[PDB]
Amino acid sequence: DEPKHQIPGNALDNWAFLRTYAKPLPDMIHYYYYVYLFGFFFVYKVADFPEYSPRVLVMAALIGSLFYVRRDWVHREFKDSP
Amino acid sequence: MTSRFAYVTCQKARNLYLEACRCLPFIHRLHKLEEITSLKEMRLIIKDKFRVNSPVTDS
Amino acid sequence: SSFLPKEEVESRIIAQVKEQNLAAGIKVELSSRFDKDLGLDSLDKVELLISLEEDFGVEVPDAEIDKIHTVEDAVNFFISNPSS
Amino acid sequence: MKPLTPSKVSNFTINFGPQHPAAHGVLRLVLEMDGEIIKRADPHIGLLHR
Amino acid sequence: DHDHYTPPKTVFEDTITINVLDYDGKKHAVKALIGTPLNKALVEYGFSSTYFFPNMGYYTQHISDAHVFIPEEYWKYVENVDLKTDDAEAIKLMFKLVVQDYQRETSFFASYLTLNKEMDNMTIGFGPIKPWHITPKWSFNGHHNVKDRMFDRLETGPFIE
Amino acid sequence: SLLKNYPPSYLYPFRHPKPEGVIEKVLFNLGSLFRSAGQGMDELGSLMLGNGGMQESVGPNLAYAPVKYNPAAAPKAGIVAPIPASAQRVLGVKEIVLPSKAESTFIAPNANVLGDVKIGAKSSIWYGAVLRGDVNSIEIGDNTNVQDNVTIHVAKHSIDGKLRNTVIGNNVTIGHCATIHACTIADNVIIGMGATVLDGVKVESGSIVGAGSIVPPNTVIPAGQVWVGNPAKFIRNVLPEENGFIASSANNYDLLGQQHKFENSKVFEEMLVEEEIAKDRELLEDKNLAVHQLYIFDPQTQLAARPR
Amino acid sequence: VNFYDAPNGPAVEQVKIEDEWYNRQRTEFNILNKQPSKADDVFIAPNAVVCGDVDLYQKVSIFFGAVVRGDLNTIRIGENSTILDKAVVHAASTSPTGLNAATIIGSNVTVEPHAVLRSCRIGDNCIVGARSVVCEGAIMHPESVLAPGSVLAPGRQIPSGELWAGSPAKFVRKLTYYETSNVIRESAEHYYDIATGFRNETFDHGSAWRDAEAYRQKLVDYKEYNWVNYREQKYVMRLQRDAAELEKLL
Numbered sequence A: 001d002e003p004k005h006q007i008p009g010n011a012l013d014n015w016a017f018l019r020t021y022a023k024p025l026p027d028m029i030h031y032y033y034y035v036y037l038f039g040f041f042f043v044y045k046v047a048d049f050p051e052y053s054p055r056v057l058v059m060a061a062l063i064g065s066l067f068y069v070r071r072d073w074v075h076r077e078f079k080d081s082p
Numbered sequence B: 001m002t003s004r005f006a007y008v009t010c011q012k013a014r015n016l017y018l019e020a021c022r023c024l025p026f027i028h029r030l031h032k033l034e035e036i037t038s039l040k041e042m043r044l045i046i047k048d049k050f051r052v053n054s055p056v057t058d059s
Numbered sequence C: 001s002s003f004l005p006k007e008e009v010e011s012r013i014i015a016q017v018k019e020q021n022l023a024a025g026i027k028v029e030l031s032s033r034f035d036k037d038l039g040l041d042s043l044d045k046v047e048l049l050i051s052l053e054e055d056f057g058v059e060v061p062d063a064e065i066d067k068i069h070t071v072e073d074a075v076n077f078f079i080s081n082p083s084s
Numbered sequence D: 001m002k003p004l005t006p007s008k009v010s011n012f013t014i015n016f017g018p019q020h021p022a023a024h025g026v027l028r029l030v031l032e033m034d035g036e037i038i039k040r041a042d043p044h045i046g047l048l049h050r
Numbered sequence E: 001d002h003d004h005y006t007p008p009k010t011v012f013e014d015t016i017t018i019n020v021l022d023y024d025g026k027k028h029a030v031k032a033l034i035g036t037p038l039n040k041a042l043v044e045y046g047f048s049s050t051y052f053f054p055n056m057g058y059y060t061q062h063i064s065d066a067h068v069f070i071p072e073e074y075w076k077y078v079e080n081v082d083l084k085t086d087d088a089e090a091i092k093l094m095f096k097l098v099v100q101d102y103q104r105e106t107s108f109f110a111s112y113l114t115l116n117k118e119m120d121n122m123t124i125g126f127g128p129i130k131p132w133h134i135t136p137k138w139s140f141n142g143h144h145n146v147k148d149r150m151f152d153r154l155e156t157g158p159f160i161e
Numbered sequence F: 001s002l003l004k005n006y007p008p009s010y011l012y013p014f015r016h017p018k019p020e021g022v023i024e025k026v027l028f029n030l031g032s033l034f035r036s037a038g039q040g041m042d043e044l045g046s047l048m049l050g051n052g053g054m055q056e057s058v059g060p061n062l063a064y065a066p067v068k069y070n071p072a073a074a075p076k077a078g079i080v081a082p083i084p085a086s087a088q089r090v091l092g093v094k095e096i097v098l099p100s101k102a103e104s105t106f107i108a109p110n111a112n113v114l115g116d117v118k119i120g121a122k123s124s125i126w127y128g129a130v131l132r133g134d135v136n137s138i139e140i141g142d143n144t145n146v147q148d149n150v151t152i153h154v155a156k157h158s159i160d161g162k163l164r165n166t167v168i169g170n171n172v173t174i175g176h177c178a179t180i181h182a183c184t185i186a187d188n189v190i191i192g193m194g195a196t197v198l199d200g201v202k203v204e205s206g207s208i209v210g211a212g213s214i215v216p217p218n219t220v221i222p223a224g225q226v227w228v229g230n231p232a233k234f235i236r237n238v239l240p241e242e243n244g245f246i247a248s249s250a251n252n253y254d255l256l257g258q259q260h261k262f263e264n265s266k267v268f269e270e271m272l273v274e275e276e277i278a279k280d281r282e283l284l285e286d287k288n289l290a291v292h293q294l295y296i297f298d299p300q301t302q303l304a305a306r307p308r
Numbered sequence G: 001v002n003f004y005d006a007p008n009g010p011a012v013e014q015v016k017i018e019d020e021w022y023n024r025q026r027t028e029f030n031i032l033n034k035q036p037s038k039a040d041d042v043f044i045a046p047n048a049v050v051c052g053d054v055d056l057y058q059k060v061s062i063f064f065g066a067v068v069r070g071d072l073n074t075i076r077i078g079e080n081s082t083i084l085d086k087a088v089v090h091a092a093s094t095s096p097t098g099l100n101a102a103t104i105i106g107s108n109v110t111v112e113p114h115a116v117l118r119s120c121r122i123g124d125n126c127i128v129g130a131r132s133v134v135c136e137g138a139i140m141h142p143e144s145v146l147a148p149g150s151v152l153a154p155g156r157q158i159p160s161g162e163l164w165a166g167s168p169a170k171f172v173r174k175l176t177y178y179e180t181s182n183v184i185r186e187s188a189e190h191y192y193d194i195a196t197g198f199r200n201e202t203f204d205h206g207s208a209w210r211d212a213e214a215y216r217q218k219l220v221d222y223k224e225y226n227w228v229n230y231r232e233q234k235y236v237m238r239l240q241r242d243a244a245e246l247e248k249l250l
């Protein structure tokens, strides 16, 4: 026997939390199609954007990073409900 | 390869009836009989068809 | 080994057992041999197993049909089996 | 440790009914065909058993 | 000092049998040793390579897992996992990519269950799995029709094919 | 087969036919020059290599090998054969005893079977087994398996008249690395792996001698008993099912011997052709190849069988 | 006699052992559908015989006289495991225990001369002594040693970290930490060095083929050498066998 890390939580509760990731998985082409199209149009529009201060650009990048939701997070938490 | 621990049809009609019951859904779909009749309903007729020949005893 | 509650599966099997003409009247419960208590015939036993096939979406082996004898035995068979 | 090799399956259990440019009479012919090639032919007779 | 030595039990005493329901619906009696993980015992029996998928962890893909259905009475012996670690990440990807809708409350992975004496004559079943891909060599089209054995696969795990 | 235009190199990989084109003839002569120069360089290297020079030669076939014939002691199990006249004017031996085996018998090329050895049909002598009948005869019955690295030995009867021949009965299994000196074994006996059976030992039918057990000399193991231990002692009687195992082991090793005899008996040219069969089987595993669209190949021999 | 469903085909020409004038034993050869697999650094001695479904991992050494027969079931030898002289490793079709009957040998396992292993699980860093018999279904757990002249009966177990001896093998002493950590691995490394040496002075095609080539060349010069299309003959033999099997009435 060896000293081991204590695992917080009950075994069955943690397994139940992990089982909430087993949901119908959409194929990634649907996201990719829209991202490609809107990205092409976006790159066309960017050349017309006004020149922004570097400070504002960095703050916008920080806000976007904070606001970005990982695709797995929506996967676990999605409910087909109002 | 050995240890002492190592080593330690009267109902033919029943089998035929089981075959008929298991094959019933297939003939329902093949003969388009879903709407007209139910599987249980046909399963009931098959028994009467079997029961007509009960008296015989020769193998 | 009971995958689903014993009370539920028992109530369901006895519900299907009641559907057969006899196997009722004063004694429709556990510990009732199909052919020695309920008056059922062997073909009727096989059909009853097929009706349980429809109720619980799981097949029964024919050798198991040779092994099954009682209302307890059928519910035990269906509770044991993971597909249930 | 040498791989096994699988095979193909035949379907298309056609029914070739009474057909005029053929030998005269009524022929019911059940043909099992792998694609456009026949694998079994089972002639159904008794349609003119008097 | 010098307490009594305990002679080991022979293989016959410490072999437990488990009844495993395979994908075709046949029940197999899998003799297994106490102290072995369920995945290893299932692999040694001779189940096909389609029945198993690698553990989708950063450093656990050499292990071969299976989607199994465990009766409520034996849920206690399943191993707890820390969500804030990457073992939970392996588990979450295995649900996300392999099990998906075929999940049930009895769904578990074999590596996290260890066989013991009290698990004798336990009935487990192989759980349905969706088509999955890691590498073209290590993938599942969805057809359970190869007759090989996961035992006969010397390849340790997925890397560049 | 479907096609008859296959290249001659493809049809005869072991030895290409005589060169017919000018280019082929020039290549043949250049190969001759290369062969001679390579042998010269080989000998020059062997000089530096020292005593022996790492020389290699073909080894004699000792699976069917003779022993000196004794006019006093006539052969008992094996046959006696004359030797070539030139060897007569060199060696001076008139006749030599040779082993006697049935056609179904499998003897491994590694095994050394010498002289007075009679082996029955469906019996197998496996790899590394040494069977010496130089001084006295060895008899092996049908469906008897002498496994890997087994040594069977005999001695002279001597003044007492004690029989020092080795008689092995039918359906007898001798486990790997077992040593059997001049003993008698009855039918349907398993000798365990590593077991030593010394002089004078009679093992009765239906008995099992355990693995790594030395049965003392002049000891009779009675029928249907299991004996194990360094001074081999009785432990239990053979179970009724264990008898069926004894027979099953004999039969399984008969089938095994048939397979191994089939593999070993192929000639070189056939072996090399089969190596090419395996190789182009591996190359033809890809089913998107252009040639696969052209033809369907026979599985056992990857030759074009029918067009696709 | 002739296996007509063999993977590479039936044998067109089979030669009897009496007719052999030289030893043709192959150190690695194929038994029907079972093919031995070897790594680049695996040493098989010229005397050694390896047949059947035997998988040789990297740094596996098979020394002189050792026979590893993988005919009945699979044999796996782990990394840096050495089979020493005249040691037989074989696999049973089934095991008495009911587990897998394959003969699995772990890493850094030394099987000493004349030791017989049949359908056993040998754990990593184990030593089987000289003339030690491990029977079917016997499992040696890792870091365990079986002393010379000892028998592990079918379905028996040797626990980890223990030295076992005797014909009915029994516990003798617990192996020390230094032993299990170093010496057991070091023995396998030493025999790997010896086998590496033997490999370094081995030529790819040693000059023993010249003697048979001389006979073949003599036959060619005297015009007795015959060119046989073995592929076509195999195809024809299989066709004839199928036709005869269709014709037969019983």
Ligand SMILES: CCCCCCCCCCCCCCCCCC(=O)OC[C@H](COP(=O)([O-])OCC(O)COP(=O)([O-])OC[C@@H](COC(=O)CCCCCCCCCCCCCCCCC)OC(=O)CCCCCCCCCCCCCCCCC)OC(=O)CCCCCCCCCCCCCCCCC
Pocket: A034, A035, A038, A039, A042, A057, A058, A060, A061, A062, A064, A065, A066, A068, A069, A070, A071, A072
């Ligand atoms: C209707 C269609 C739906 C889409 C709508 C939009 C359609 C597109 C229109 C136009 C698209 C072009 C522009 C979009 C952005 C370009 C990205 C892209 O297209 O790639 C394809 C991408 C899919 O590609 P994929 O290969 O399938 O996914 C890869 C991932 O693994 C995906 O897997 P994952 O999601 O599971 O994993 C995500 C992972 C992926 O990693 C990333 O997201 C990388 C992003 C890093 C920044 C990217 C570079 C930023 C430079 C911006 C340049 C402009 C400013 C210039 C100056 C800035 C100087 C930096 O990141 C994370 O784990 C979560 C954190 C996210 C940011 C991480 C950085 C955190 C820093 C904050 C520190 C604070 C913490 C302190 C406390 C900590 C405590 C210890 O599609 C998109 O994601 C587009 C979604 C649009 C939402 C973006 C929201 C803001 C956008 C502008 C802000 C820029 C910051 C970027 C935020 C994250 C963007 C991904």
Ligand SMILES: CCCCCCCCCCCC(=O)SCCNC(=O)CCNC(=O)[C@H](O)C(C)(C)COP(=O)(O)O
Pocket: B010, B011, B012, B013, B014, B015, B016, B020, B027, B046, B049, B050, B051, B053, B054, B055, B056, B057, C042, C043
């Ligand atoms: C739509 C498709 C419907 C198909 C219809 C098919 C109808 C087939 C009808 C053929 C009838 C037979 O075979 S009749 C088979 C021979 N008849 C006999 O009586 C032999 C022994 N009989 C008995 O034991 C009992 O009468 C019995 C009640 C059978 C108990 O069955 P079990 O032996 O198990 O106990």
